[PDB]
A paper describes a structure:
Lysins are lytic proteins that locally degrade the cell wall, either to provide access to the inner bacterial membrane during infection or to release virus progeny by cell lysis. P5ΔV8 adopts a lysozyme superfamily fold consisting of an N-terminal lobe (NTL) and a C-terminal lobe (CTL) connected by a central helix. Φ6 P5 adopts a lysozyme superfamily fold and our structure of P5 bound to a tetrasaccharide substrate analog shows that the enzyme contains a single glutamate (Glu95) in its active site.
The G2238T mutation corresponds to a [name] amino-acid substitution in the gene for the lysin protein P5, which locally degrades the cell wall, either to provide access to the inner bacterial membrane during infection or to release virus progeny by cell lysis. To understand the molecular basis of the thermostabilization of P5 by the [name] mutation we determined the crystal structures of P5ΔV8wt and P5ΔV8V207F at 1.4 Å resolution (we could not obtain crystals of P5wt or P5V207F). Residue 207 is located on helix α8, facing the hydrophobic core of the protein. The larger phenylalanine side chain in P5ΔV8V207F neatly fills the cavity, with no significant changes in the protein. Similarly, the melting temperatures of P5wt and P5V207F determined by DSC were 52.6°C and 58.3°C, respectively. These data indicate that the [name] mutation increases the melting temperature of P5 by between 5.7–7.6°C. Additionally, the heights and areas of the DSC curves were greater for the [name] mutants than for their wildtype counterparts.
Residue numbers in the entry: 48 to 54, 60 to 220
The structure:
Amino acid sequence: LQALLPKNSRVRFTTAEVDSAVARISQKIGVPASYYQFLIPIENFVVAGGFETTVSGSFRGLGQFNRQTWDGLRRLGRNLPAFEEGSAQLNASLYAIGFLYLENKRAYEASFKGRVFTHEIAYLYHNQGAPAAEQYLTSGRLVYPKQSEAAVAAFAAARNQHVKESWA
């Protein structure tokens, strides 16, 4: 039973086709497959036989990208289709998730020298955007606070991981 959040069109992908595409793309672009396995179930509906993803409104597809974030990657030179087309596609959305991870990793490492970009930190960056993610890490307040309980839990873990020097 999916929890109702206060805030029509979906696409369904099978687990196997997601897994196959993740394995291929993650290897190609140098992003851990485990990051995709972490992110996809948080952002999308896990249903019998795979995942369903909303492709209407501001946030779309497996990565739940908005157009501005998607277009940012294109501006960097990433070969993606237009937001509205690619966000409804398996491969393009998986490339975008990974390209964004790579960009956010650079942003995190530039602001916090010597620290490790963990999966939960990467998800914070993915969801809030790098500027707002850095703001949450430093201030403890979300710029865009209307997120799911699972997301908020991930962000709290991310900040814990960020501040603490080691596992403990």
